[model samples]
Target chain A: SQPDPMPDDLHKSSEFTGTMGNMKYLYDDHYVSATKVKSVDKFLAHDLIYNISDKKLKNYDKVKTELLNEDLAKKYKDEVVDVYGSNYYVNCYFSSKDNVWWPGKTCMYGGITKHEGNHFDNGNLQNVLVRVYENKRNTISFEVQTDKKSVTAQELDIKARNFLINKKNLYEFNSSPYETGYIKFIENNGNTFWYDMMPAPGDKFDQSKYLMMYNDNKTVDSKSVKIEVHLTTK
Target chain B: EAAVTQSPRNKVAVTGEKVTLSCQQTNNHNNMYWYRQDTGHGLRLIHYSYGVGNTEKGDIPDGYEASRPSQEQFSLILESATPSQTSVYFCASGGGGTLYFGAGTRLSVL
Candidate 1:
């Protein structure tokens, strides 16, 4: 089925005016399992949520119990609806390819299935690429431009690494520089996920808009180190 | 010296022009990918390869062509480029559950 055409009212649909003012409202659906994650703004709500959820992402039932009670959930939902200009839909809509993608589906096939929010602008950069991927595990990652906000490279990197650590109460160790201007770290979890972060200065010798590095390996291996070194080197 | 490298970090092209975004990864990973990042669409996968000479279509594969002639090189081609093709292009190599990303190629199709 033709992925339903992009909603013409996207601008009107994703505007959040009301404010619960914090990460809780932003990630209203954090309790949902990675595969079963669904909401109105077409998975757009979780764009940043994926990062914060981190290790908790693997534990569905644990989160469902702790995320939000009915009263707070309503407040979170209301804020999401306002910012998104729409409420969550109960029915599932297939993309142009007539493929279905949600929490449990093995794969998603098709074109622009949901609405992405308004584009942020940077001087001379009319268009930017932001990639989002869900690997074999339900874990997901997004590659976005750092300049979208004024946060520094180390600030964002530490904030991200810290978010994962604090969110899961995980501990961090062995931090170092990976490439020309990037840093790497790891937090103790079920196994371990390697973190590689790079600052995305407006103008730099290389093109990095803030890079976060990780893979699907259960434990760090030689391949992981080599890939990190090569990709970070200019 | 990041393992993967992309050239012409900044590009400006006229409408109907020919544009090629190149990416190279030295880690000897068997897979490579080409993605164009835009504001709302985020990073939509255009092309990916599991090994040399084997390229597969991703979610959005229109007005784009990809090549993997060797283990280290994979290029994305925009034949008769359109303004819509103007987006930051990122290249990545995946293996053992990890992904390696190069800086991005910012292409502006005027």
Candidate 2:
């Protein structure tokens, strides 16, 4: 039989209609969100240059290894400006959860002032700062509650409702497509549809510790007339 | 450490549940975002506001809604909930640079 469309916790379906799974970053007019660490971030220019890993990269690590390789990041290495006021050409990284550092989903914003500076010879090392949010697998925890002693379903709903009460900001519309960022629609990974873009976080801080929903399609909606609470960090 | 404080960390409901989600960022950054994670692959987008009161739709925002009052907070709302509406949710902030995630809320439908 076909595997369950969505996990028990998630019931809503995916209805997103876009394609942006292979991109390095979700760019919009105002911001760019790179799910994983960019090849350039782990680069070491000059020294006769480039990260040693890239030089030794096998076919597997080719993508991330050759960051400063040719045109990708090398061409725009110049014009790097320092906003955080620093020396070395690094933007730094932050963890979404504590201790557990995410590899790509960055929390720390790095400098964006031409981090990929072409002036590798200047020795000035000018780098722009952009936020680097890391999403560590260890940081993500799932509670199945299959046992009898597990948290009560009511309690879980209460918690989930709380997250919904203060649910994450959601805007679904096809009219203002331009306002939307990278549109990625895929069907292989069990995801009906997926879109990664840049938008502001929501208002209010009231919400549950986690959000559980069903996915039959990619599109999701909120329940009307219900109290909502969002998941939060201590 | 980055503090992503939220409120009402718990809730209860039936079908047609109109719930709202929220988030706040003290990082004093320029961007913010909202996403919903369900089993399958990874976290998915719901809605987001770039700035105060500016809202934008995500990959999935059919029955949901959102708003950003100021640089500090964001909100997500569900017009109606169904048994199918059950799912865990998460809110995050600090972007245009890096992104941050809140603890997370557990959701269920009886």
Which candidate's lDDT is highest?
A: 1
Residue B110 CA displacement from its true place in model 1, Å = 0.7
What CA root-mean-square deviation does each model show from the true structure? 22.3, 22.3
lDDT of 1 by residue, A1-234 (tens): 112212231111012221111111111222122222322222322121211132323211111111113342333332321111001111122244321212211111110111123223433212112121112132323222222221122222333333333342222111112221212322223232223232222211111111111101011221112111111211
True lDDT of residue A16, candidate 2 = 31
TM-score, candidate number 1: 0.32
CA shift at B87, candidate 1, in angstroms?
0.8
Task: Note the DockQ of each predicted structure.
Answer: 0.01, 0.02
TM-score of each: 0.32, 0.33
Per-residue CA lDDT of model 2 for A1-234, tens digit only, reads: 123222222212132332211011111111221211323343334101111121211211111221223443343244332211001101111223322212222211221222342224444322211111112112222221111111112222222222222322222222221222222222233343322222222322111111111101111111111111112111
Docking class of 2: incorrect
Cα RMSD for predicted model 1: 22.3
